[PDB]
């Protein structure tokens, strides 16, 4: 059912110009690192896929409904 | 007075006479390089040091590195050298998908000697080199004035060959027999031999793909660590100078 | 064109593609394209984009793309194919993979993307010392990186385990870089002299202020500067402009030549700015610093002209005039998180200018004529604080200790010295001897109430670590 | 490229317009032309060679002498 | 300051000889050999751009 190249395919399709995709990915990596630290130190548990918000305009990530368990 | 060598020197005589003494040199042989016991680097068989291996094959003293051998105080045994030879001779490179305990996994792959003793005999080139080195080694000043070279060589020859064959023959058969009897193994070789003189698509594809590559294109490598040694020398000199201040 | 090329390439028979690929490579490297460098839509960009839109069915060598991208502003078009060929190489061959990786790393280095460079070189090396040294260089720990590189070289000397040549070059290059970051110029000068490295030699020689005062020394440096001038670059043009300024200061040149040199430097800087991607990347910062350097070069030229002309008649009134410009210069500083070498360059340049001023003003007196020393002390103190925030071992201490000898004891210099002494308390372990000796006796505390109060507070805090509860209690109560 | 540091080093590092390195897309290659040069000279001076034979105009011992002559 | 003239003269022995490789000397090899000879004699500037071809033609004529 679910292979490992779905999100990459979507976001390659969302940016016809490659410079935009390159910059978006560069921002996304740093943002995911920050979110990982945040979620790991504070014991935030139920990180379902519908709680990750990705801004197609910059590459920002906002994890919603983040509470400690 | 010193004991003089026999007419023909053989490995048996030298090894028996000088048993219980340290060997002159120890050489370790690997798949593609060799080194000495206390050497930290290495020598390639294709490098200029192939002369040493050739001499080892031919059992001849290497007169070309005589001064280097002298500096190291290598011992001689009646002008020969005993050498011990140790025989050690007997994934997907440049892929970013390889794993390593110090690296992230990656998502495109599923998941994580014989020993020998030999003797090297001396030659005339060795004596020539010895005298030449003595001529230009300061101690009069110099260790050997050239004008005395002939007398020194005469005395060395007198010591080396104390007995000769000075018995006349009476006919041609006697001379033939004497020539046959006195033959020498090192001078009984034979005359040499006259001197003599599908995948293409893959090779062409690789050559095309390496176009305009500055360094790898030419090749399609003998490190010596010279810059590192220069840095070490300068650092030592600077530290030593700072010691005074 | 970029919409049409793939459709027409799809119609070429598969047996004729190599000929068209060779023709395309031949057309890309033509010499008449240089009459189109500045026009933004140029044919090189269009051809490269069209070729890369169908990369698997149209192959272009990595280094052709790398060479063209830097000159015709097609950086991301080249990055696309270069880092798509790493995931899925077109041909199964070690040499092709290595060449592709080399081109990719070159582009990353030129664009100023450090993290991707380190991440790419860490998945490629074979020794563990190379990996550890690269990782320690990533987090700005230069001493550890140097030690790891030394260990890697020493262990490679044995020869039991084979290695490649790229790692061999990397060890040397990054050892030199780490040495530069650690301010080891004394040995680098002799290394460059022995190795015949002209640019490194100039960089080392520029760090010696007194070396540029002797006529023979500068006549010598002129030959090296002229030798490296057939391939002009912004740094070489800066060195030429600095030499021109020095010549002008000594009545050996007209201001017009200086202005012409500065104009050429500015034009080259603008041309290099126009070749980068439009949006602000990490490669633009050094060019902005260069712009500031050129502005201050002109300002220093005005300084020298006014100083010489006004002091020709022995008129000690221009100190007030110089004060305004110096105050203006006191507010143009880099950001704290900028590279340390930038601060090094700023400090060296300001030291050169202040040395010129001091040399001109010292021959006249035999208060108002001792401003260069105050400015040097201020800039050195600021650099020491910045170096401390960079966690550089002994660099801040070395700078604060190299200022032991300075004449013209004045209120400003005395206050700066007291501030430096207050800064000597780094709050580091195993420094009890220095604190105890300072507590024993250190100058006088009669200067100002706040200074002595903070000194007593520091003494009490230091005593707190040793466990002297009541002693520190009384100290900061007082 | 001036400076003496070297070119093509894959490490952490420019003029406005660098010069293009030399290259050849496909052909005989220098390794063959340089080896055929001596035979070409021999053909030139020898007057002419008949059909069905060429290249072997000097014995192995004379080619070494000629190369030594050139070097000296 | 100073130029180490002893680091380029040593480069002469890196390239193989004509007898060693079997290739008739050409413009590239002569150009490679030119610089150490110039540095040995004290010609700091170097050599004229169009000397290697002249030398190659002379060698062919000889």
Automatic annotation (TrEMBL), chain B:
Residues 20-180 form the Spt20-like SEP domain. Residues 180-197 are annotated as: Disordered. This is Spt20-like SEP domain-containing protein. It comes from Chaetomium thermophilum (strain DSM 1495 / CBS 144.50 / IMI 039719) (Thermochaetoides thermophila). The chain holds residues 109 to 477 of 1192 of the full protein.
Automatic annotation (TrEMBL), chain C:
Residues 64-478 form the FAT domain. Signal peptide: none annotated. Belongs to the PI3/PI4-kinase family. TRA1 subfamily. Associates with DNA double-strand breaks. Serine/threonine protein kinase which activates checkpoint signaling upon genotoxic stresses such as ionizing radiation (IR), ultraviolet light (UV), or DNA replication stalling, thereby acting as a DNA damage sensor. Recognizes the substrate consensus sequence [ST]-Q. Phosphorylates histone H2A to form H2AS128ph (gamma-H2A) at sites of DNA damage, involved in the regulation of DNA damage response mechanism. Required for the control of telomere length and genome stability. This is Non-specific serine/threonine protein kinase. It comes from Chaetomium thermophilum (strain DSM 1495 / CBS 144.50 / IMI 039719).
From TrEMBL, chain D:
Transmembrane segments: none annotated. It is found in: Nucleus. Belongs to the TAF12 family. This is Transcription initiation factor TFIID subunit 12 domain-containing protein. It comes from Chaetomium thermophilum (strain DSM 1495 / CBS 144.50 / IMI 039719). The chain holds residues 617 to 693 of 770 of the full protein.
TrEMBL record, chain E:
It is found in: Nucleus. It comes from the Eukaryota. Transmembrane segments: none annotated. This is Putative transcriptional coactivator HFI1 protein. It comes from Chaetomium thermophilum (strain DSM 1495 / CBS 144.50 / IMI 039719). The lineage of its organism: Eukaryota, Fungi, Dikarya, Ascomycota, Pezizomycotina. The chain holds residues 217 to 278 of 485 of the full protein.
């Amino acid at each position: 059912f679910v292979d490992h190249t779905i999100v990459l395919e979507y976001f390659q399709g969302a940016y016809p110009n490659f410079a935009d995709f390159w910059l978006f990915r560069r921002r996304f990596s740093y943002q995911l690192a920050a979110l990982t630290f945040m979620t790991y130190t504070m014991h935030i548990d139920k990180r379902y896929p519908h709680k990750m918000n990705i801004a197609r305009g910059s590459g920002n990530i906002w994890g919603s409904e983040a509470v400690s368990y | 007075t010193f004991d003089a060598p026999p007419y023909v020197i053989t490995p048996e005589y030298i090894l028996k006479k000088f048993a219980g003494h340290p060997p002159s040199l120890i050489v370790h042989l690997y798949q593609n390089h060799f080194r000495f016991d206390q050497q930290e680097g290495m020598f390639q068989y294709k490098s200029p040091m192939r002369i040493f291996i050739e001499h080892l094959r031919n059992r001849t003293v290497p007169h070309e590195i005589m001064e280097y051998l002298i500096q190291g105080g290598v011992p001689f045994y009646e002008g020969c050298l005993i050498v011990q030879v140790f025989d050690h001779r007997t994934t997907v490179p440049f892929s970013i998908h390889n794993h390593n305990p110090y690296i992230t996994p990656s998502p495109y792959v599923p998941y994580p000697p014989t020993v020998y003793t030999v003797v090297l005999m001396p030659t005339a080139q060795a004596l020539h080199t010895d005298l030449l080195l003595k001529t230009v080694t300061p101690r009069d000043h110099m260790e050997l004035d050239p004008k005395n070279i002939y007398e020194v060589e005469a005395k060395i020859l007198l010591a080396t060959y104390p007995k000769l064959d000075l018995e006349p023959t009476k006919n041609a058969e006697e001379t033939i027999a004497k020539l046959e009897k006195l033959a020498h193994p090192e001078h009984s070789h034979k005359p040499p031999e006259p001197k003599v003189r599908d995948e293409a698509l893959a090779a062409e594809q690789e050559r095309y793909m390496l176009t305009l590559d500055e360094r790898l294109s030419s090749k399609l490598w003998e490190p010596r660590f010279e810059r590192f040694k220069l840095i070490e020398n300068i650092k030592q000199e600077h530290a030593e100078k700072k010691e005074q201040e | 064109w970029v919409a049409l090329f793939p459709m027409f390439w799809s119609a070429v028979p598969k047996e004729d593609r190599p000929d068209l690929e060779r023709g395309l490579v031949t057309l890309l490297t033509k010499d008449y394209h240089s009459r189109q460098m500045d026009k933004r839509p140029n044919v090189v960009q269009s051809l490269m984009a069209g070729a890369v839109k169908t990369w698997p069915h149209c192959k272009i060598p990595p280094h052709v793309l790398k060479f063209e991208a830097k000159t015709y502003d097609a950086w991301y078009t080249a990055l696309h194919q270069l880092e798509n060929a790493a995931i899925k190489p077109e041909i199964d061959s070690a040499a092709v993979r290595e060449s592709n990786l080399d081109a990719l790393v070159d582009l990353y280095s030129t664009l100023g993307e450090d993290d991707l460079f380190y991440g790419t070189w860490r998945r490629r090396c074979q020794f563990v010392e190379t990996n550890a040294g690269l990782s320690y260089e990533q987090h700005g720990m230069w001493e550890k990186a140097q030690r790891m590189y030394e260990s890697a070289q020493i262990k490679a000397r044995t020869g039991v385990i084979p290695f490649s040549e790229a790692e061999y070059m990397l060890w040397e290059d990054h050892w030199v870089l780490c040495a530069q970051k650690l301010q080891q110029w004394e040995i680098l000068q002799d290394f460059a002299k022995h190795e015949n490295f002209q640019d490194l030699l100039l960089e080392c020689a520029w760090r010696n202020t007194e070396y540029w005062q002797n006529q023979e020394n500068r006549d010598q440096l002129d030959t090296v500067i002229k030798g490296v001038m057939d391939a002009p670059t912004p740094r070489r043009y800066f060195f030429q402009a600095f030499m021109s300024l020095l010549k002008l200061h000594n009545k050996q040149e007209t201001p017009q030549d200086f202005n012409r040199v500065v104009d050429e430097a500015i034009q080259l800087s603008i041309r290099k700015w126009h070749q980068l991607p439009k949006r602000l990347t990490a490669a633009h910062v050094p060019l902005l610093q260069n712009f500031q350097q050129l502005v201050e070069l002109h300002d220093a030229s005005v300084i020298c002209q006014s100083l010489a002309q006004t002091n020709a008649s022995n008129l000690d009134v221009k100190s007030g005039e110089l004060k305004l410009l110096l105050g203006s210069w006191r507010d143009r500083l880099p950001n704290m998180w900028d590279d340390i070498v930038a601060w090094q360059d700023l400090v060296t340049w300001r030291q050169h200018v202040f040395g010129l001023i001091n040399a001109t003003y010292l021959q006249l007196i035999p208060s108002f004529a001792y401003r260069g020393y105050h400015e040097t002390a201020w800039i050195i103190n600021r650099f020491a604080h910045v170096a401390r925030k960079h966690a550089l071992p002994e660099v801040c201490i070395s700078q604060l200790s190299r200022i032991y000898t300075l004449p013209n004891i004045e209120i400003q210099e005395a206050f700066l010295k007291l501030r430096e002494q207050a800064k000597c308390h780094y709050q580091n372990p195993d420094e009890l001897t220095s604190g105890l000796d300072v507590i024993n006796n250190t100058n006088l505390n009669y200067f100002s109430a706040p200074q002595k109060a903070e000194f007593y507070t520091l003494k009490g805090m230091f005593l707190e670590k040793l466990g002297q509860k009541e002693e520190a209690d009384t100290a900061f109560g007082t | 490229n001036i400076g003496g540091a070297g070119s093509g080093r894959p490490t952490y590092t420019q003029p406005a317009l660098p010069k293009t390195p030399a290259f050849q897309l496909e052909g005989e290659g220098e390794r063959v032309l340089n080896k055929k040069k001596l035979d070409e000279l021999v053909r030139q001076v020898c007057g002419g060679t008949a059909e069905g034979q060429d290249g072997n105009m000097l014995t192995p011992e004379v080619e070494e002498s000629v190369l030594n002559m050139a070097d000296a | 300051l100073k130029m180490n003239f002893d680091l380029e003269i040593r480069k002469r022995y890196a390239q193989p000889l004509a007898v060693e490789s079997g290739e008739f000397p050409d413009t590239s090899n002569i150009e490679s050999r030119m610089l150490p000879f110039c540095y040995e004699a004290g010609l700091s500037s170097g050599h004229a751009p169009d000397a290697a071809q002249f030398m190659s033609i002379a060698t062919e004529t000889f």
